[PDB]
Amino acid sequence: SGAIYVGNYRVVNRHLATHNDWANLVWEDSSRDLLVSSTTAQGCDTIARCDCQTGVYYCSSRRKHYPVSFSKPSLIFVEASEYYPARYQSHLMLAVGHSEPGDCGGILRCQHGVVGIVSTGGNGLVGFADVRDLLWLDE
Ligand SMILES: Cn1ccnc1[C@@H](c1ccccc1)N1C[C@@H](C(N)=O)CC1=O
Ligand SMILES: [Zn+2]
């Protein structure tokens, strides 16, 4: 679990959004596993606007933050789960690291701020949904 809190927006994994997030929907994309809802209180996270390929992510199943090298946002196949049928997820970035079901929502950050959140795992890999192209989050 986990979310990004920027301005009056809450960014979460779409598959973990609550029925309350849907009532306060701003934007969602099933192909990106992202959902953004509106908030009453102002958040303090800053979104990175960069092309960094190194950062640090939080892994809740280890209670540890790991430094990783991660790939460019791309269209990557994701096997079927209880949340989605087998499909290509877009804007996804992979790193070599630990990620289990329960780890989605962990933040990946570089020197410029928040890059994305954990969205995929297994096989000694971790996948992050990129948010650096969502410029409207800043206004
Ligand atoms: C199904 N699958 C393939 C690779 N990873 C997963 C699992 C998964 C997520 C996180 C850690 C460990 C496994 N995901 C990915 C999520 C998605 N974005 O579609 C939904 C889901 O259950
Ligand atoms: Zn950066």
From Swiss-Prot:
Cited function: Cysteine protease that cleaves viral polyprotein and specific host proteins. It is responsible for the autocatalytic cleavage between the P1 and P2 regions, which is the first cleavage occurring in the polyprotein. Also cleaves the host translation initiation factor EIF4G1, in order to shut down the capped cellular mRNA translation. Inhibits the host nucleus-cytoplasm protein and RNA trafficking by cleaving host members of the nuclear pores. Counteracts stress granule formation probably by antagonizing its assembly or promoting its dissassembly.
Catalysed reactions listed for this entry: Selective cleavage of Tyr-|-Gly bond in the picornavirus polyprotein
Self-association and partners: Homodimer.
Protein name listed in UniProt: Protease 2A
UniProt-annotated catalytic positions: H15, D33, C104
Domain of life: Viruses
From-to range in the entire protein, with total length: 869 to 1007 of 2193
Sequence positions that bind Zn(2+) 1: C50, C52, C110, H112
Species of the source: Coxsackievirus A16 (strain G-10)
